[PDB]
Amino acid sequence: PFCNAFTGC
């Protein structure tokens, strides 16, 4: 989904 700490995006 939306960007993440480094996972999502």
How far apart are alpha carbons 7 and 5 in whole angstroms?
6
Q: Which two tokens stand for residue 7?
A: 């996972």
Only one residue has tokens 């995006």, namely 9
How far apart are alpha carbons 4 and 7 in whole angstroms?
5
Contacting residues for 8 by C-beta, under 8 A, at least 6 apart: 1, 2
HSE-CB at 9 with a 13 A cutoff on CA atoms is 4
Whether residue 1 contacts residue 7, with contact meaning beta carbons closer than 8 Å, is answered with no
Q: Which two tokens stand for residue 3?
A: 């960007």
How far apart are alpha carbons 2 and 5 in whole angstroms?
10
> In angstroms, how far is CA 5 from the centroid of its own chain?
6
Whether residue 9 contacts residue 3, with contact meaning beta carbons closer than 8 Å, is answered with yes
Across 1-9, b (16+ Cβ under 10 Å) vs e yields eeeeeeeee
